[PDB]
Amino acid sequence: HLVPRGSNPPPPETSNPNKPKRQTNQLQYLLRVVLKTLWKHQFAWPFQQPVDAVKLNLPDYYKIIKTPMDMGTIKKRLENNYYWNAQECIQDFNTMFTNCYIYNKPGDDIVLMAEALEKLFLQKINELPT
Ligand SMILES: CCN1C(=O)c2cccc3c(S(=O)(=O)NC4CCCCCC4)ccc1c23
């Protein structure tokens, strides 16, 4: 190529083999209710898989975004009991939304989509059990 096209990292890790299986009510609720609701939102699809910098023509994406995150990764982390607590899961959602804000211009369509998803997410985490 005569113009830079970018390249993609391996996707984020989704399992911690050394970590003990510690199931919790909040993590179960995050997987079964919060993530499922977010996944089905009309604006979710761009956030469901890792950014393909090459296919999306975002050649500098991984120059700018040092800690990629997407909902498919979060889903797998929940499934694999990767998180010790709800706060770690919530931090990954936050990384995903803030990545979008970092990379893109405040007025961009993708940013509107992220903001709508983030607003729903923040509502849903008020539901977490004790
Ligand atoms: C959430 C990951 N992500 C981006 O940060 C981003 C920037 C620009 C386009 C784009 C796309 S895209 O599929 O190339 N463009 C979508 C942009 C949002 C408007 C409606 C759907 C098209 C998907 C995921 C993205 C981006």
Protein residues with CB under 6 Å of any ligand 1 atom: 46-47, 51, 56, 58, 100, 103-104, 109-110, 113
The amino acid present at 51, given as its one-letter code, is: V
* Residues sharing a CB contact under 8 Å with residue 105, sequence separation 6 or more, in sequence order: 111
CB atoms closer than 10 angstroms to residue 130? 4
The DSSP call for residue 108 is S
The resolution, in angstroms to one decimal, equals: 1.6
- Farthest-apart Cα atoms in the chain, separation: 56
Q: Which of 55, 92, 110, 118 to mutate to test the pocket of ligand 1 (most atoms within 8 A of CB)?
A: 110
Which residue segments constitute the domains of the chain, with CATH numbers given?
24-128 (1.20.920.10)
* Closest of 112, 73, 69, 113 to residue 94, by C-alpha: 69
Measured distance CA(58)–CA(105) in Å, rounded = 13
- Write out the two tokens for 107: 């007025």
Report the structure determination method: X-ray
* Closest of 8, 94, 13 to residue 53, by C-alpha: 8
- Write out the two tokens for 10: 């391996």
